Amino acid sequence: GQVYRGFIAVMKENFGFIETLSHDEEVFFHFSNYMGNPNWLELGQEVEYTLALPAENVRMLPKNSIPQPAVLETTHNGVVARPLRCINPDQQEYAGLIEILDELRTTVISQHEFGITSLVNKRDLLQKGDLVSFRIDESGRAACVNAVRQKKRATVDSIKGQFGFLNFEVEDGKKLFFHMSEVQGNTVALHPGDTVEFSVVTNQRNGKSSACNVLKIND
RNA sequence: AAAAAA
């Protein structure tokens, strides 16, 4: 009967997780306890919930309902020291952590926690070692976090339903996997022999790489 | 083939 507010952090097939107001923990909810159509829930969405502990009576709130700290002016470059727990559910800390380093890159100047509402692209796989460009808020947390990834180019080699492979080699001479959900813009269909621009992400838990932010560049 | 996580 205890009522809280928070932000959608994870969405699975019939359940998800809500990031707490303080951005320091997550709460489970089953979709049968969401007061609406869960297909319309997006990551970052503001919600009100009641603890049963899992959450119940999860309710969508109007955008900008939940006050947040002011975001301070100017951007910074940082490095991710720890991911958000959503991508490593066994890690002790909930929040991710970004560090700003000194010029030798061997002393931490400042540290900034982040959560789902910190991220510009809430689907990006932000992991230890990733470079980010971001803002700091009045509470010291990271906001407006953008991943800074090197762009590569390659031809599409094959397409199998909702995924395919690029002529860009990773381990063992294997060709780089991509999922169609990463294809940017209003491209109706890629074909083998098209050229795409992309970044490479390697999942540090299972070692698998994929192409992200895939943009067709040939006419 | 389920409600705690490709």
UniProtKB/Swiss-Prot annotation:
Name the cystine pairs. Answer: none
Q: Which residues form the CSD domain?
A: 3-60, 75-148, 151-216
**Effect of substituting Q127A:** Decreased affinity to RNA
Which superkingdom, per the lineage? Eukaryota
Relay the domain remarks: Composed of 5 canonical CSD domains that mediate RNA-binding as well as 4 degenerate CSD domains (non-canonical) that do not bind RNA. Interactions between canonical and non-canonical CSD domains mediate RNA tertiary structure specificity by reducing the conformational heterogeneity. The CSD domain 1 mediates association with the 3'-UTR of msl-2 transcripts. CSD domains 7-9 at the C-terminus bind to poly(A) sequences of RNAS.
What is the role of this chain?
Answer: RNA-binding protein that acts as a regulator of dosage compensation in both males and females. In males, acts as positive regulator of dosage compensation by promoting assembly of the MSL complex, a multiprotein complex that mediates X-chromosome dosage compensation. Promotes MSL complex assembly via association with roX1 and roX2 non-coding RNA components of the MSL complex, facilitating the interaction between non-coding RNAs and mle.
Q: What is the protein name for this chain?
A: RNA-binding protein Unr
Q: Which organism is it from?
A: Drosophila melanogaster (Fruit fly)
**Which gene produces this protein?**
Unr
